[PDB]
Design a protein around this ligand. Sequence first.
Ligand SMILES: NCCC[C@H](N)C(=O)O
Length: 241
Amino acid sequence: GGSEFQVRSFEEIKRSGEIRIGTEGAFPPFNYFDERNQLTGFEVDLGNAIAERLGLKPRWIAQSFDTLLIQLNQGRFDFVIASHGITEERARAVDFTNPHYCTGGVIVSRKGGPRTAKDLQGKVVGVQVGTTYMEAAQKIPGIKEVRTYQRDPDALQDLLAGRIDTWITDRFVAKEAIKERKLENTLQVGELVFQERVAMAVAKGNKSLLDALNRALAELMQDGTYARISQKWFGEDVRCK
Ligand SMILES: NCCC[C@H](N)C(=O)O
């Protein structure tokens, strides 16, 4: 159906009564399509609670991860919530909110497989395109091959099939995939390779919206809504401490 692309200030958004939110929809349990083919996840619930707290009806747009930041700047959405770690490189093209969770990238291998960055010597490592996982894998020398996937669950599929030695991904995504697929006796979570603060993104220079999102997030963290949503998803509070 197409849409009107525009980078919108907070007051322009407020006038419309609607906030357009970009996400990926292939990164469970943060944002994904469930068994009845509807968009959900910790970040969807969070996104909706943000929209609500601002007096705005959310309109969700799922699309491939590698495209999200560039379509944000082109004006397809007002903000993106799609598990983006804050990086200096990314902050050149977008403005990040205060982080809505903290986490890290972790080595995942089959039983008896690589557990440390050092173990990745002559190994084949699977990572999703445009991610901090791919970025870190590119900097670990002596990996035989960094294999890059458009979608992160595809890397998991290749780890299981034995086409790669190691998948590097988010620690919560790794834990949940193992629980979901009952892979406790088949997969092995190794070392935390790096830690990261994960945040919403706004088009570069969209300071009015940036500030409103920060305020709404602060409010959710104070009024118990964040705690409730984190509990539902993780049985614990995942905010940066
Ligand atoms: N597809 C989602 C990737 C999320 C990861 N934390 C990153 O920042 O690259």
